[PDB]
Design an enzyme around this catalytic site. Structure first.
Site, PDB file in Angstrom:
ATOM      1  N   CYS A 111      -4.602  -7.031   4.079  1.00 44.87           N
ATOM      2  CA  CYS A 111      -3.595  -6.528   3.126  1.00 44.87           C
ATOM      3  C   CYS A 111      -2.391  -7.462   2.998  1.00 44.87           C
ATOM      4  CB  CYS A 111      -3.097  -5.137   3.543  1.00 44.87           C
ATOM      5  SG  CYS A 111      -1.771  -4.450   2.487  1.00 44.87           S
ATOM      6  N   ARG A 114       1.676  -5.675   3.289  1.00 44.95           N
ATOM      7  CA  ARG A 114       2.148  -5.173   4.577  1.00 44.95           C
ATOM      8  C   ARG A 114       3.645  -5.232   4.846  1.00 44.95           C
ATOM      9  NH1 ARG A 114      -2.436  -8.009   7.188  1.00 44.95           N
ATOM     10  NH2 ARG A 114      -1.061  -8.619   8.892  1.00 44.95           N
ATOM     11  N   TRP A 283       0.254  -0.275  -4.405  1.00 46.61           N
ATOM     12  CA  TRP A 283       0.232  -0.584  -5.817  1.00 46.61           C
ATOM     13  C   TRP A 283      -0.566  -1.849  -5.997  1.00 46.61           C
ATOM     14  CZ3 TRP A 283       5.198   0.014  -3.586  1.00 46.61           C
ATOM     15  CH2 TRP A 283       5.803  -1.190  -3.155  1.00 46.61           C
ATOM     16  N   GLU A 288      -5.910  -8.664  -8.879  1.00 48.79           N
ATOM     17  CA  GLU A 288      -6.951  -7.682  -8.563  1.00 48.79           C
ATOM     18  C   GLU A 288      -7.654  -7.189  -9.799  1.00 48.79           C
ATOM     19  OE1 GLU A 288      -6.143  -4.654  -5.268  1.00 48.79           O
ATOM     20  OE2 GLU A 288      -4.131  -5.229  -5.894  1.00 48.79           O
TER      21      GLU A 288
END
Ligand code: HEM
Ligand code: HEM
Ligand SMILES: C[C@H](O)[C@H](O)[C@H]1CNc2nc(N)[nH]c(=O)c2N1
Ligand SMILES: C[C@H](O)[C@H](O)[C@H]1CNc2nc(N)[nH]c(=O)c2N1
Ligand SMILES: NC(=[NH2+])NCCC[C@H](N)C(=O)O
Ligand SMILES: NC(=[NH2+])NCCC[C@H](N)C(=O)O
Lengths: 413, 414
Positions: A111, A114, A283, A288
Site C-alpha cells: 500500500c 500508508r 481512496w 489504478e
C-alpha cells in the site's frame, strides 16, 4: 519439484525446473504466494501458538502510548492469558481492535497510502450474526466511506474466526466492482477480470443486466452458512463519468468508474486470532483506474481505441503511442474525479507522500515493510521517488493476508 | 388437503379446494403428469415377493403369445427365472423377451396414436453397457439407424435395468434431439422456450452456448450412478427439415426448420417387475406436433402472430378466425417441407384413421386398448377426426412406459 509461474495477461502458466541448478530465488515477483495467504481451518488455533501471538500483540498495544498503563498492562496480559487458557480463543477490547486495524494497514507492504494509516474509521461488527445483518453494516460502510465524493478511509470488522467451519466471508474481490460477461458473439463486455465471479452470481440466480458497467451484487456468508445474494442499493454507488479536459470526444467513449476502492476478500490477523471478513477502503490513485482498470489487456483494454481516436500510429510500437495514450487516459481520470469533486491522488503526489511516510516510519519504529514491485506506480516508475528507494518486504503483525477464494473451499447444503 | 392445477400456458399454478364438496357418485384425466403415470427413484431393490408374481405373470404373457406354445420351455423358463430370481435377486430377460416387452409397452402406451405400428419395432440391446461414453455410442447408433436418411425407422435402445436404485442409467434430456432455449439480454427468449431450465443445466455443466433459435442440445448422460457426462451430438447425425410453404414463398424467409427425429428420452420401461429407467425410443413425426404445438404454442416458438401478419389477416380481431387459417398453413408448410425432402411424416387425419383401425384390431384381438382421449385427439380439427367421436378408457397395464421424476431433482453430487 517445480515452481508454478503465471502470466497475468495470457493466463499462460509456466513450471520452473531450472531453479534447482541454482548457486550456493526471490519469490518477489509472485503475486499470490502462500507466504501472504492465510487459509481455512477445522480446528481452532492451537493454544501453544495462539498464546505467544496474543501476548506479543498486547505488549505492542500497551507499548504504543506515552506514559504506559503499566499495571493495566500486566492486568490485561494476565486477564487475556487466563481468558485464553480457559475458553481457548479471546476477544479484543474495542480500543485494541482500533489499534490493530491501523497497525495492520501500517503493515501492508503493498500500500502506498500508508501515510494515512493513523486516519482510519473502524466499524465493530463483531456481534453480527447474519448475512442480512452484514449487508446492513456494509451499506453503512459504503455510505460513510463515500461521503458524497469526499472519500473517507474505513474498515468494517466482522466476527472473528472461532473454529473454522463458522466463517464470515464476503465473496467479492472488493465491495463495488463491475460485472463481466462472455458474450455470444465471442466478445467480452464489462470487466474481464470479474468473469468467473460474475458467472457465479448468475448461478445463484442473479439478474444479469448485461452492460459494461453493471455493479456486481454482494455475496455474503455468515457463521458457516451458504452465501446470500444482496443487490447493492444504487443510491449508494457513486460513480465518476470519464471525460478529457481537451478531448471532447473522450466523453463519447461512455467511460466511468466507481469512486470507492474497498477491498473485500482480505483477512485481518491479530494477536493470533483472525477475521476472514473485514472489508476496508481508502481512496483511489489515478493510475489504478487509468492504467490498470482501463488499459490492461486483461481488463477493459481501451488503449488501442484511445490511441486511434488520438490520431497516433497505432501500428508502430516505436511511435510510443501507448505512452501517449495512457497518459491522456490518466489525466482524464484525474480530471473527471477533480471536476465531480471526488477524492483521488495522482501517482506522483502519492509517491512523494509515501516517501515522507517512510522517513517518519524509520525514524519512528525502525523500519517499514515495502513491496517495491507494488509500490512503484504502473507507469512513469523512475520519475517516481519510490523507484529509486531500496526496500525490504517482510510480514509483521497484525497484518492483512489474502485468502483462498471461498467458492473453492466450501461446504454446501 | 387440496389439488394442484397448472396452466401449461402461463405456467400459473392453482389450488383446488371445492372438490371436497363433491358428490357421492373427480377425473384426473386433464392432468399432464399424474403420480399414477410416474415411476420414481429407489434405495432398495424390488422386494422378492412382488418381483416374483410380476415376473411369472410376465413370463405367462410371453409364452401365452406364440401360436402353439412351447409349454415345456414355458415351465422351464418360469422355473429358471424363479431360480434366477431367488439366486441373484433380480433377473435377466431373453432378448426375444425384451423385444416382446418393448412392443407391448408401446402397445400399452395410452397417449400414442402411432400404435398400429406397434409390431414394427427395432430393439437395441444395450443392457451390458456400463459407461456414459458407451451410452453415447449406442445413442448415436440409434439416431443414425432411426434417421435412415429420411426414411425414419421406429426403434428403441434399452439400457441396463434397475439394480438397487442408486445404480440407474438416465438420459437427462426430454428427447434425443431438442433445440435449446436461452433467456436473452434484451428480455426476449430465443430458441425453444420449453428447454429453458434444461439448457441452463447444460450451461452449468460447461456447455458452449451457441445462442441461436435452433441449437441442438447436448446429450446429458449418467451411467451406473455416477454424475452426468456432457456429450455434444454429431451434427452429421442430426437431420433437419427447413420449413417452406408450397405457395407462400415468403414462408421460407422465416428461417424455420425442425428435427426429423421424435425420440423420447426420459421415459421408463416397466416389465415383469423389473424397470429400465433409460430406454429412448422413437416413431416418426405427425405434422400437428411441429406445426401446431412446437411452432404455435405460446410457450414454444410462438410463430402464429407473424404467420398471420405476413398472410395479411386481421390479427387484432379474434373473430376473424385468422389463427385457424394461419395454423392450417403452417401445418401444410411442415407436411410439404417433410414430403419435399423425403422425410417420413404423417398428417393428423391419416394418423387418426389408422389409429381407429388399430382399436378395431386391438379389441377384436385382445379385448381392449388403453386410450387417453385427451392426448389422442389432435390439437387441431378435433371433431373432423374419427378419434374425437370415439369413447375410450384410459388404463395402465404391464409392461408400460412410465414418466419419471426429472433426474436433476433427485441426484447425488460427488
Ligand atoms: C488512504 C488511501 C489509500 C490509498 C491512496 C491507498 C492506495 C493503495 C494502492 C495504490 C494500492 C494498490 C492496489 C492494487 O494495485 O490493486 C493499495 C493496496 C493495498 N492497500 Fe492501500 N490505500 C489506501 C488506503 C488503504 C487502507 C485504508 C487500507 C487498510 C485499512 C489499505 C490496505 C491496502 C492493502 C492490504 C493493499 C493490498 C491489496 C492487495 O494485496 O490486493 N489501503 N492501496
Ligand atoms: C410409428 C410412429 C409413431 C407415431 C406417429 C407416434 C406418434 C405419437 C404422438 C402424436 C404422440 C404425442 C406426443 C406429444 O404430444 O408429446 C406420441 C406419444 C407417445 N408415443 Fe407414439 N408415436 C409413434 C411411435 C412410437 C413408438 C415407436 C413408441 C414406443 C416404442 C411410442 C411411444 C409413445 C409414448 C409413450 C408416448 C407418450 C409421450 C408422453 O407421455 O410424453 N410412440 N406418439
Ligand atoms: C507479475 C507482477 O508481480 C504483477 O503483475 C504486479 C506488479 N506490481 C503490481 N503493483 C501493484 N500496485 N498492483 C499490481 O497489481 C501489481 N501487479
Ligand atoms: C392440460 C392438458 O391435459 C394438456 O395441455 C394436454 C392435452 N392433450 C395433449 N395431447 C397431446 N398429444 N400432447 C399434449 O401435450 C397434450 N397436452
Ligand atoms: N486505492 C486502493 N485502496 N485500491 C485498492 C483496490 C482498487 C483497485 N486497484 C481498482 O483499481 O479497482
Ligand atoms: N411422434 C412422436 N413420437 N412424438 C413424440 C415427441 C415429439 C414432440 N411432440 C415434438 O413435437 O417434438
Amino acid at each position: 519439484q517445480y515452481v508454478r509461474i503465471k502470466n497475468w495477461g495470457s493466463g499462460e502458466i509456466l513450471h520452473d525446473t531450472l531453479h534447482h541448478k541454482a548457486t550456493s530465488s526471490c519469490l518477489g515477483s509472485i503475486m499470490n504466494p502462500k507466504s501472504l495467504t492465510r487459509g481455512p481451518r477445522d480446528k481452532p488455533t492451537p493454544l501453544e501458538e495462539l498464546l505467544p501471538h496474543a501476548i506479543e500483540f498486547i505488549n505492542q498495544y500497551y507499548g504504543s502510548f506515552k506514559e504506559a498503563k503499566i499495571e493495566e498492562h500486566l492486568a490485561r496480559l494476565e486477564a487475556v492469558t487466563k481468558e485464553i487458557e480457559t475458553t481457548g480463543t479471546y476477544q479484543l477490547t474495542l480500543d485494541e481492535l482500533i489499534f490493530a486495524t491501523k497497525m495492520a494497514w501500517r503493515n501492508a507492504p503493498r500500500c502506498i497510502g500508508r501515510i494515512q494509516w493513523s486516519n482510519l474509521q473502524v466499524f465493530d461488527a463483531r456481534n453480527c450474526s447474519t448475512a442480512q445483518e452484514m449487508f446492513q453494516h456494509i451499506c453503512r460502510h459504503i455510505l460513510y466511506a463515500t461521503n458524497n465524493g469526499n472519500i473517507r478511509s474505513a474498515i468494517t470488522v466482522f466476527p472473528q474466526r472461532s473454529d473454522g467451519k463458522h466463517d464470515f466471508r464476503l465473496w467479492n474481490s472488493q465491495l463495488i466492482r463491475y460485472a463481466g460477461y462472455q458474450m455470444p458473439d465471442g466478445t467480452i463486455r464489462g470487466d474481464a477480470a470479474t468473469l468467473e465471479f460474475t458467472q457465479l452470481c448468475i448461478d445463484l440466480g442473479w439478474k444479469p443486466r448485461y452492460g459494461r458497467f453493471d455493479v456486481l451484487p454482494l455475496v455474503l456468508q455468515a457463521d458457516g452458512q451458504d452465501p446470500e445474494v444482496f443487490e447493492i442499493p444504487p443510491d449508494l454507488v457513486l460513480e465518476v463519468t470519464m471525460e478529457h479536459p481537451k478531448y471532447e470526444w473522450f466523453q463519447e467513449l461512455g467511460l466511468k468508474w466507481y469512486a470507492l476502492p474497498a477491498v473485500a476478500n482480505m483477512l485481518l490477523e491479530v494477536g493470533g486470532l483472525e477475521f476472514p471478513a473485514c472489508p476496508f477502503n481508502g481512496w483511489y490513485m489515478g493510475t489504478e483506474i487509468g492504467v490498470r482498470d482501463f488499459c490492461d489487456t486483461q481488463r477493459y483494454n481501451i488503449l488501442e481505441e484511445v490511441g486511434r481516436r488520438m490520431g497516433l500510429e497505432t501500428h508502430t510500437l516505436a511511435s510510443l503511442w501507448k505512452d501517449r495514450a495512457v497518459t491522456e487516459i490518466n489525466v482524464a481520470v484525474l480530471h473527471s474525479f477533480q471536476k465531480q469533486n471526488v477524492t483521488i491522488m495522482d501517482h506522483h503526489t502519492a509517491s512523494e507522500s509515501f516517501m515522507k511516510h517512510m522517513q517518519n516510519e524509520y525514524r519512528a519504529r525502525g523500519g517499514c515493510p515495502a513491496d517495491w514491485i507494488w509500490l512503484v506506480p504502473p507507469v512513469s516508475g523512475s520519475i517516481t521517488p519510490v523507484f529509486h528507494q531500496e526496500m525490504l518486504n517482510y510480514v509483521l503483525s497484525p497484518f492483512y493476508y489474502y485468502q483462498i477464494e471461498p467458492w473453492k473451499t466450501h461446504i454446501w447444503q
